Design a binder for this molecule. Structure first.
Ligand SMILES: [K+]
Ligand SMILES: [K+]
Ligand SMILES: [Mg+2]
Ligand SMILES: [Mg+2]
Ligand SMILES: [Mg+2]
Ligand SMILES: [Mg+2]
Ligand SMILES: [Mg+2]
Ligand SMILES: [Mg+2]
Ligand SMILES: [Mg+2]
Ligand SMILES: [Mg+2]
Ligand SMILES: [Mg+2]
Ligand SMILES: [Mg+2]
Ligand SMILES: [Mg+2]
Ligand SMILES: [Mg+2]
Ligand SMILES: [Mg+2]
Ligand SMILES: [Mg+2]
Ligand SMILES: [Mg+2]
Ligand SMILES: [Mg+2]
Ligand SMILES: [Mg+2]
Lengths: 171, 71, 118
RNA sequence: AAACUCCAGUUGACACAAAAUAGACUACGAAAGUGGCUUUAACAUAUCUGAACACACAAUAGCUAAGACCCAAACUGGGAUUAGAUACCCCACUAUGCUUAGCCCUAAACCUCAACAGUUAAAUCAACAAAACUGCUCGCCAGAACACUACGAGCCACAGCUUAAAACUCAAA
């Protein structure tokens, strides 16, 4: 998070803000503001770090960064409010909307898609091909079918050496 | 509108709930037996797999769990 | 943000009332608050009897403290006021002067059809 | 009638219950819901559509555990009524309604109006509801009853929920 002494986004570029009294600096800092003001500073930090034009807020990159800041705020909210179903819905919807943005950015501008992933620390994931419950019967059977495959592979390798050994003896 | 269709459904559901109430001990014995057969049918399906793959016994360390018991 | 503390103090003599205000403003400062003003609204009869700290009150000293503080200071200050025996009732609200009133052109008529329709 | 008679009235102290008036308002939220006060956090998406099952929710009732308990209150008990009264009427009291942590996943969950976009000119239009329609997409339906059922499968559900037939029968519904 930005330091609490950080000035608000509105008062950072006023001339003479560095020569005012310390009390005036406290009143124009993040310490004396609500959390939404800290999120505006975070968004601007990511914009300058990632996007080519930090002032283009309608680009697909800026929307991903803006929504990524909202997503992080919901996660912090839900860390303290674990039964807040309203904000849990907002988080899951926001993650889905960003994935749609990342999908559309990956298809149109891959170089920018890579910088967004590195800058925001997003590991893009491709969606599953099928949506179907993995119930107990399927989970148990799939595990058995993998064990059976693993055992068959071992037996097939012990039928390569014995055949190899016998062939050498003939010579 | 009239509620004559709801009334037909109402009586059907009342009589069903009452029927289940009267026979809840027989139905519990029947349900227990079905779950046993369901478990046996499941164990056979897994045994078919390793047997059709050439193995003679279950994979080393494999125990088929009871996936239908209340526990 | 900017807050307004509406403080009702136990009716006391001037020395004990000043000691309570100083002790209350220092608690705000200890929690990071920047105190802007202190207003005396006068001692008056309470609108109803208030029981606080095993005592019944019919009169109190009404004071206001305008101050800026971090959002985390409110929760801690409310707890401090609950333990001060000389405070009858203390409430911290967002300062009303921060909220800017939006301009109003007037009372637009509402169609009666919507009333019954709605 | 029963019940109470450490009862009732005034005064004072006094809650983990419930939130007159405002509200003749029609707001917030995806819906369910949300109407005492304060504060903090906070109400996704710069094209739409997109799931019985994926993901996350979902009134009331109900389950498991630990608490609170004013009042209300299934059940139960008592009083009365009645041909009978397992009711309606009166009294008492419990589960329950509350909190905490888990479940359960239903509703006449209904504006009984699917989402989005567009039109008010055509014929205005079976009827009633709520003026009549177009584009586009998903979901769903194909006589009644059997059937919010049977069997299968899934599920913390085990007297449950979801999905959901057939045979016999009728000329209606
Ligand atoms: K109220
Ligand atoms: K309705
Ligand atoms: Mg029937
Ligand atoms: Mg959609
Ligand atoms: Mg759906
Ligand atoms: Mg489907
Ligand atoms: Mg359903
Ligand atoms: Mg529910
Ligand atoms: Mg409950
Ligand atoms: Mg009572
Ligand atoms: Mg009786
Ligand atoms: Mg009780
Ligand atoms: Mg309460
Ligand atoms: Mg409703
Ligand atoms: Mg739809
Ligand atoms: Mg049919
Ligand atoms: Mg049902
Ligand atoms: Mg069923
Ligand atoms: Mg079944």
């Amino acid at each position: 998070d930005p330091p609490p002494s950080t000035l608000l986004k509105d008062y950072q570029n006023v001339p003479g803000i560095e020569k005012v009294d310390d009390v005036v600096k406290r009143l124009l800092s993040l310490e004396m503001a609500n959390k939404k003001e800290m999120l505006k500073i975070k968004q601007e930090q990511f914009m300058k770090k990632i996007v080519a034009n930090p002032e283009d807020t309608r680009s697909l990159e800026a929307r991903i960064i803006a929504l990524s800041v909202k997503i992080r705020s919901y996660e912090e909210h839900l860390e303290k409010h674990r039964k807040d179903k309203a904000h849990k819905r907002y988080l899951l919807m926001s993650i889905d909307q960003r994935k749609k943005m990342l999908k559309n950015l990956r298809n149109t501008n891959y170089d920018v898609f890579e910088k967004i992933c590195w800058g925001l620390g997003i590991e893009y994931t491709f969606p599953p091909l099928y949506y179907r419950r993995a119930h107990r019967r399927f989970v148990t059977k799939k595990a058995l079918c993998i064990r059976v495959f693993q055992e068959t592979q071992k037996l097939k390798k012990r039928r390569r050496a014995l055949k190899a050994a016998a062939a050498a003896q003939k010579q | 509108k009239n509620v004559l269709k709801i009334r037909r459904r109402k009586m059907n559901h009342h009589k069903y709930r009452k029927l289940v109430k009267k026979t809840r001990f027989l139905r519990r014995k029947v349900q227990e037996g079905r779950l046993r057969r369901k478990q046996i049918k499941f164990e056979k399906d897994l045994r078919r797999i390793w047997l059709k793959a050439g193995l003679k016994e279950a994979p080393e360390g494999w125990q088929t769990p009871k996936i239908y018991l209340r526990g | 943000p900017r807050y307004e503390l509406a403080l009702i103090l136990k009716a006391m003599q001037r020395p004990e009332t000043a000691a309570t205000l100083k002790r209350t403003i220092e608690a705000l400062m200890d929690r990071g608050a920047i105190v802007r003003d202190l207003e005396n609204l006068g001692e008056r009869a309470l609108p109803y009897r208030i029981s606080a700290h095993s005592q019944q009150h019919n009169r109190g000293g009404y004071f206001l403290v305008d101050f800026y503080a971090p959002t985390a200071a409110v929760e801690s200050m409310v707890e401090h006021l609950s333990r001060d025996i000389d405070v009858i009732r203390g409430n911290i609200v967002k300062h009303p002067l921060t909220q800017e009133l939006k301009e109003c052109e007037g009372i637009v008529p509402v169609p009666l059809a919507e009333k019954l329709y709605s």
